[PDB]
């Protein structure tokens, strides 16, 4: 999940 969100940055 971290990756899925972190892609914003
Ligand atoms: C949420 O975005 C997310 C993405 C990817 C993973 C994840 C966990 C483990 C591996 C892996 O190859 O482990 C080898 C032991 C790959 N991707 N978790 C959460
Ligand atoms: N929000 N985006 C990021 O923080 C981000 C981190 C890392 C990367 C990225 C891109 C390309 C490579 C590579 N060619 O190995 C590695 N990491 N993009 C975005
Ligand atoms: C620039 C756009 C894609 C954005 C990225 C992160 C946070 C807010 C907007
Ligand atoms: C440089 C551009 C393609 C970008 C990369 C990662 C996150 C937001 C924009």
Q: What is 1-9 written as a DSSP string?
A: -HHHHHTT-
Task: List the resolution, Å.
Answer: 0.8
Residue 3 CA neighbour count, 13 Å, CB half: 0
Instruction: Please name which ligand lies nearest the alpha carbon of 7.
Output: 2
Long-range contacts of 2-9 (CB under 8 A, 24+ apart): none
Long-range contacts of 1-4 (CB under 8 A, 24+ apart): none
**If you search the block for the tokens 């899925």, which residue do you land on?**
4
Cα 1 to ligand 1 centroid, rounded to whole Å: 8
CA–CA distance, 6 with 4 (Å, rounded to integer): 6
Cα 1 to ligand 2 centroid, rounded to whole Å: 16
Token readout for 3 is 């990756």
CA–CA distance, 7 with 1 (Å, rounded to integer): 10
Question: In angstroms, how far is CA 1 from the centroid of its own chain?
Answer: 7
Q: Is 2 in the pocket of ligand 2 (CB under 6 A)?
A: no
CA–CA distance, 1 with 8 (Å, rounded to integer): 13
φ/ψ of 4, rounded to 5, equals: -55, -35
Structure solved using which method?
Answer: X-ray
Q: Is 9 in the pocket of ligand 2 (CB under 6 A)?
A: yes
């Amino acid at each position: 999940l971290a990756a899925a969100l972190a892609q914003a940055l």
